[PDB]
Amino acid sequence: DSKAPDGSVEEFLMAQNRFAVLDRSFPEDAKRLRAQVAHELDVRFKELEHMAATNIFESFAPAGGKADGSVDFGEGAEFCTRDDTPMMARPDSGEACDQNRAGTSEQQGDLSKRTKK
Amino acid sequence: GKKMMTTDGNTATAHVAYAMSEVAAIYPITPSSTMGEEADDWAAQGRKNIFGQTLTIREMQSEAGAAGAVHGALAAGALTTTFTASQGLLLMIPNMYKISGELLPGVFHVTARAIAAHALSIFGDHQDIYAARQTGFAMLASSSVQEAHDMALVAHLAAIESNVPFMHFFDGFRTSHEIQKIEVLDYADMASLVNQKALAEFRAKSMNPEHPHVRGTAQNPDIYFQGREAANPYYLKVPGIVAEYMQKVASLTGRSYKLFDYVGAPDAERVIVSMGSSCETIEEVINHLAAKGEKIGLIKVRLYRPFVSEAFFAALPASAKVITVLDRTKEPGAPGDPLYLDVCSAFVERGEAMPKILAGRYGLGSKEFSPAMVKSVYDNMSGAKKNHFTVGIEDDVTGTSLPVDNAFADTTPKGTIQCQFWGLGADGTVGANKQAIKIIGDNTDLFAQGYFSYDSKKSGGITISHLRFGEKPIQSTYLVNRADYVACHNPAYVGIYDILEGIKDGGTFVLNSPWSSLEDMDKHLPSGIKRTIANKKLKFYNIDAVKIATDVGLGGRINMIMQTAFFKLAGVLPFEKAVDLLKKSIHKAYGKKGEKIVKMNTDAVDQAVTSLQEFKYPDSWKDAPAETKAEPMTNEFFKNVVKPILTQQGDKLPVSAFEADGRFPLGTSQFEKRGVAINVPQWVPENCIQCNQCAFVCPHSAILPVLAKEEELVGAPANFTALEAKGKELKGYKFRIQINTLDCMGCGNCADICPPKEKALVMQPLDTQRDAQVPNLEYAARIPVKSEVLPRDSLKGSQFQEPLMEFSGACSGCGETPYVRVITQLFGERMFIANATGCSSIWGASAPSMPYKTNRLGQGPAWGNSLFEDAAEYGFGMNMSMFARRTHLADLAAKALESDASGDVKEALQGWLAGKNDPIKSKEYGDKLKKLLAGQKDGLLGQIAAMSDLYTKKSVWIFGGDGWAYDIGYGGLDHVLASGEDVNVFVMDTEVYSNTGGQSSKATPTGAVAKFAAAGKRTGKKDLARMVMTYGYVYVATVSMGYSKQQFLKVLKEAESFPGPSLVIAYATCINQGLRKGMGKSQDVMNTAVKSGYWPLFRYDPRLAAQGKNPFQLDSKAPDGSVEEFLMAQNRFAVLDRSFPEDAKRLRAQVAHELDVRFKELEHMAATNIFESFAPAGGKADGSVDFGEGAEFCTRDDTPMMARPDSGEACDQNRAGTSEQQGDLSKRTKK
Amino acid sequence: GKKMMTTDGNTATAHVAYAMSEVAAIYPITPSSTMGEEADDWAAQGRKNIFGQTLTIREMQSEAGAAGAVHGALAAGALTTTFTASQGLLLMIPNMYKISGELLPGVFHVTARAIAAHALSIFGDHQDIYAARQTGFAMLASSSVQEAHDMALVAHLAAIESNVPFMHFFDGFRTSHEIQKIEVLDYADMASLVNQKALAEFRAKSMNPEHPHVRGTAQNPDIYFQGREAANPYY
Amino acid sequence: GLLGQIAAMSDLYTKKSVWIFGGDGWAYDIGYGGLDHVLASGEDVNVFVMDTEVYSNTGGQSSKATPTGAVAKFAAAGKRTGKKDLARMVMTYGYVYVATVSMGYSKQQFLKVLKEAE
Amino acid sequence: KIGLIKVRLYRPFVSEAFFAALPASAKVITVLDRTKEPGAPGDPLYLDVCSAFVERGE
């Protein structure tokens, strides 16, 4: 909604004691820092200009769905989704499951095949 | 009306909280987590509260956020509740003062848990609730599961009528996780007790623009004091309101309560005053002892705040001459703990008889408070009368502990059957016990109780179930120590743990093992057990649960068989009814996929009932030969501290065994060698291409690359097969991949990614591998690690460095530990780790197991866990220390350059100063100074010589999960990175709060299923990386091991060497994501995560911009279209598809769209020509200046807030207009 | 030497805190702001503490961040201090349990101020310091501008030798802002009172990869209680 | 009955506008974690930040909103890090309405933003 | 006949040192707390002083 820097920044800063007092006390550092501010805003404005020119932006979904109901992330999982910790303990936890101590599904199945007997 | 059910304290109170609240703002913290999760589940199922509405529940970024939201909701006129504990309650304290200060009817349900001090504890005690006793909240304690229900209701009703917020609390785990058959009220009954007039008044006084008021004013000395005392009337009335609701609720339930209740001899001479679950155990002991004539009693504290001395005395027998107040907390330096001080105050104000009052401390961090300990407390009152004592520990340092005689008689009511089950992680033992409790409770008049002890180990951990069944109420709030029935479901336990301890004579001992034959049994059963079974005439049974399960088709799955064993032998039910009920239930549950899965279970039951015969044993067991002791070598600390703790004897370690500040030495995990993997890898050297990828990827450091010279392999075992080393720089070396079979967790990741089609790693049963590999790893371990051969940060070369984090308690195949292990291989010897509370702090440092270790020179990660919310600031502090102390060193150095120090010393100092912040040079010259100044003790050179641990440049790292970085610690993280200081942040993104039970975090992706996002998260994943990149001066990068180990190493080197703040976000797989083919596919899943475009890799390096080039670089390619199979291969996404296919499809398409857009934005970032540029520093210069110096107008106001020592000078306060307006006015007023 | 000066409680305290600390993590909150601002200006002016070094002071995002930084700096072996009051002190409570729990020589200088309840107030009372009484910090009160200087010094000296963090507090405004002609000591005098061996010992036990240890473990019911009573000898 | 209850809820008839007012110290520093989370929630709330580029009330201390080179307490030689870009940070969400205003430059753009944000 | 006991070290609270400052002649003692803990049986300093007299047993 605004335009590219018009070059008045130096006067802008120097008209405020929060910047000028630095100029009177540490003239060399102040000079550097005001130029740095000028560079910072130059770049930022340029970045905002591209933002305004881009055609890359993501859709906007307000809300909607919920689908009366919910499900536990461990429901019907092939391997245990919780640990042996008292931290993960829950009222409905405790049912046996594959704790990944025997390897992958594929590795397990192959060991079966290989130890057919 | 009423309704019976068997549940835990958490559910009992959530049952009431849901009914009575309209809003809940929550945050997960153990052990209160269950309440928020149930409330969410019920709201989603359609459960109505007393207003006929589903609860509005929202998860905040922290408990502080939840507390502010609760305050807003209440101020805005909605009945509100929250569930919390420990660290979380502390964060709510500021808002508590506001909520009570504004007389809002809020109710906080707290599972009382210990505060982290010398150490963190998730266990139960009152340190947290006492920390808030001054907030102005009323405090109602419940001491049992049944009471949690009742008190929760009183709290809500009283809060609504009194206008004083309530904190309803019960003991963490001891009450929150104990299962009891109790009675709960219907929601309509609760609704009927609500004071409608009060409710309407609450609504009417609330914030609303239709009839607004101003709240939260700032007040001066003139009126603040008055305003603070104006609520007095309200606090004077709360006690009576609590009493009336206890009575109103009682008329509906039949259970009466008073602010203070008394039990025991009406003429007791020795009385205990206590609060919480301890009260139940104390009472059980009183019944027992009083029946023998002892004049003892107990005063149960219900309403702790307001503390009504009159109600307290109304409960105190006049005959009491000695009173012991028990506080379940510790306030260092205080003249006495809270409850004790309150009771003392009652007696002084009463101003009459002063019986002897004693203070006792107990149960910190859920320490047992058993019957024998109650005996100690009563004996102390008639004996020594030690004051300010502790009970449950042996304080051999300050001698404050009461001796405890464990031969005390069992005090459970007549007819109580007690059971203990020793299970292995995920063998379904706990689940069957909880089912057995439900079955027995719903089909008998028996009271049932269940409590479960778990392992700090997340995988292959041992569980111990304590169950009690009886015709009389079970008040035993302590573990079972004299069991009638004991079952060991893992034959491995037999030789290592004291499983039959305290088992009654004639008790039943059931064992799962394949040792059917007397010779096999005699061969495995330790002498001690045989003697115990013998001398106690135990009903010993053995059952090859694994053979029966296999045969009936259940594939080694033993839960049903052991379940049958309990229902048949425990003796809590008659055989007929038992097997009957058990079967009926199998049809209840299961009954799913055909009658076939039902048949196997039913069959397994019958087979079990049959094969369940009394193992007969020889009278010769009475004195089996006490075996020797083939105990390997370790160190003093592992022998005297960790081993005892790992074998469950930690309770016996006296106070003298621990460091006052709670510290632990590194490397105690080196000796655990648990051997719990079912299958481990087997190296096939004929196919090995010598890449070191298997070691790089191991989540537990269970693979050891070996590079030896001929000479180093002389005494090597015959089977120590080694290949001649491949590679030019390795000409002449013998290479070997040594599998550490006992530390392996058997996940399969190594074998899964081993490059060759003809795998060099194949999974095999642990037994087929241990005999050969144990002595092999042992031998290899003594071979010098060849860290100097290849580049430290090269894929292959990194695995030739010493890993400084091994054998952690992380889950098998954990996606976080591989990253950390490698990080230590690169910087371990010089890093500080400020670890955020989470899985990484839990697998990282759960006493007594310490995975981080030192290298051969004694150097290793200096590791620390402060809190969950402050990891960044904690690491920033360590960095401040290094800055200050190393700046001090630099100053001493320059100073010594201007002295008669020797040319060599000066050369070294000049060298160190120039390379002060360079890891290579600071070490090079620091090492010279260590040599050159050796012995120097005086003057300047002496101070420098004493600061050697500051010579080499240190590496400060901050480790944390996504919950930490995206939520609770985000503000801290953000500020630290914005400081521009040299720190390194490593975020292990699991896309959920893993440790606490899979709760959603802002890092959780769109459509992922997790707690508080159980219909799939409906907001996209927060873009932490892009947010941090807006600074321009922070190195930001993403990594995924499975996609590129090289890129990971490149990122580590670039992030760490960046002289400013660095943020590295890694994709970490986790059991909570539910990887469909096992965690052994983590690497491959990490690979797909990136290829699908789900987890794009990039690096933002500010120094490139400092040299004109674009700081942003993409390291991965556009989405390859595989996201759908990527998502569908994880249950956290697949469950949604099976349950809500319509929305799940939509959400997966949204995710594909999100990642597609994001990647395009990254592509443009990498294509940009416009970028933030700047130098590393420049400036400083001694001196300061105030922003007001020489200003033309006043620069500060007339407030007490801006007043400073030098303020007060006259200035233009802008009341006369502009400089020009004043000038113009001056010309106009010339005169 | 002694020096006669006319100043307020904040300055008298800050005078000492600066001399005895190497690091300071601060956050602004009335009526203690003056202290951190003075410390910052002095460091920028090159004032030397007892180690001949200028103070390393940083402003955090809040007092919780400031307390976590203080904990980290102390854990890493730097004498550290901070200034706060009221709402800010409340935010530091979680870290206070850790700092005392790990027996760290931290020193918090607090201008006791009212807690916001039915209303906010920047003025003085002990509501805030009492809210932190169970944290394990020793608490030493000063009732005048002159005692603020003296207790501040005692608090630092005692925290170093005892390994128990200290909370030096005085009344918001009534003491923090009261001006009085008092006597302050030279930094040299303060330095000569320091227990050099305790200090060396504090640095030797601090976090350092050259000789690591693990701090902040998670403990079960088997050992937590014992671990909590282990610090009794220090208190 | 029902009509009586509905009659008693008239102060809820009109759609309300929930505003959160705060300074830069609040939004960029201490309350950032909460502000961030509340915006990420996607709920209908309006945050209005009055950026003074310092913690004003307490005496002009620097905040992350303080610009490069500005002198303030704790930035006594000019702040040596730039202003934190809270706006671009929040815009990364894609579903949050973000805007910046300056009354002296444009009262109309200010009014337009109020109407659009609310 | 009046006196004042000034509290310097509030924590740890050392009763021995408290009594070393208390006149044996003291028949009435008022403890002033500069705070308010709603619902508490008494404010912090008062509670600490009471405990001192209770434990002394005299």
Ligand SMILES: Cc1ncc(CN2[C@@H](C)[C@H](CCOP(=O)(O)OP(=O)(O)O)S[C@@H]2[C@@](C)(O)C(=O)O)c(N)n1
């Ligand atoms: C102030 C506060 N609130 C809540 C907690 C509880 N904690 C959590 C919510 C932490 C979850 C960690 O999440 P994330 O994403 O950062 O890590 P990861 O997934 O690796 O686990 S574990 C932890 C603890 C031990 O106390 C408990 O309650 O289980 C806490 N310690 N402190």
Ligand SMILES: Cc1ncc(CN2[C@H](C)[C@H](CCOP(=O)(O)OP(=O)(O)O)S[C@@H]2[C@@](C)(O)C(=O)O)c(N)n1
């Ligand atoms: C937890 C905490 N830390 C510190 C403070 C002190 N407060 C601040 C630092 C507030 C300054 C806010 O700055 P910003 O930029 O958000 O707003 P603005 O510039 O408009 O003023 S005024 C205030 C108070 C009133 O209590 C005080 O100490 O003086 C506080 N109230 N709470």
Ligand code: SF4
């Ligand atoms: S199976 Fe897993 S734990 Fe075992 S060596 Fe391989 S990667 Fe390591």
Ligand code: SF4
């Ligand atoms: S991953 Fe396979 S080929 Fe590579 S070093 Fe390991 S065993 Fe050999």
Ligand code: SF4
């Ligand atoms: S991050 Fe996940 S896989 Fe790793 S220890 Fe935690 S719960 Fe287990």
Ligand SMILES: [Ca+2]
């Ligand atoms: Ca860095």
Ligand SMILES: [Mg+2]
């Ligand atoms: Mg996580």
Ligand SMILES: [Mg+2]
């Ligand atoms: Mg401001």
